[PDB]
Amino acid sequence: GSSGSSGAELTALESLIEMGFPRGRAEKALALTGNQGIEAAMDWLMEHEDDPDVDEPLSGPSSG
């Protein structure tokens, strides 16, 4: 951990981020769910916890 003071609620998204989650995901989830809430979003996340490609590569496999 680095920082963790006070416990506020910015937004359904931010809140998620507070869980150390990636924006792209949270956002995607929230959006996917329909910006309903965390629990709702999380459900998706947890489900996509093993997503095949939550963030597909934008370039291609170039060796390595």
Swiss-Prot record:
Protein name: UBX domain-containing protein 1
Biased segments, Acidic residues type: 48-58
Superkingdom of the organism of origin: Eukaryota
Domain UBA: 8-48
Record-listed N-acetylalanine modification sites: 8
Localization annotation: Cytoplasm
Job description of the protein: Ubiquitin-binding protein that plays a role in the modulation of innate immune response. Blocks both the RIG-I-like receptors (RLR) and NF-kappa-B pathways. Following viral infection, UBXN1 is induced and recruited to the RLR component MAVS. In turn, interferes with MAVS oligomerization, and disrupts the MAVS/TRAF3/TRAF6 signalosome. This function probably serves as a brake to prevent excessive RLR signaling. Interferes with the TNFalpha-triggered NF-kappa-B pathway by interacting with cellular inhibitors of apoptosis proteins (cIAPs) and thereby inhibiting their recruitment to TNFR1.
Entry text on domains: The UBA domain specifically recognizes and binds 'Lys-6'-linked polyubiquitin chains.
Underlying gene: Ubxn1
Subunit details: Interacts with MAVS; this interaction prevents MAVS oligomerization and thus disrupts the RLR signaling pathway. Interacts with CUL1; this interaction inhibits CUL1-mediated degradation of NF-kappa-B inhibitors. Interacts with BIRC2/c-IAP1; this interaction prevents TNFalpha-stimulated RIP1 ubiquitination and subsequent NF-kappa-B activation. Component of a complex required to couple retrotranslocation, ubiquitination and deglycosylation composed of NGLY1, SAKS1, AMFR, VCP and RAD23B. Interacts with HOMER2. Interacts directly with VCP.
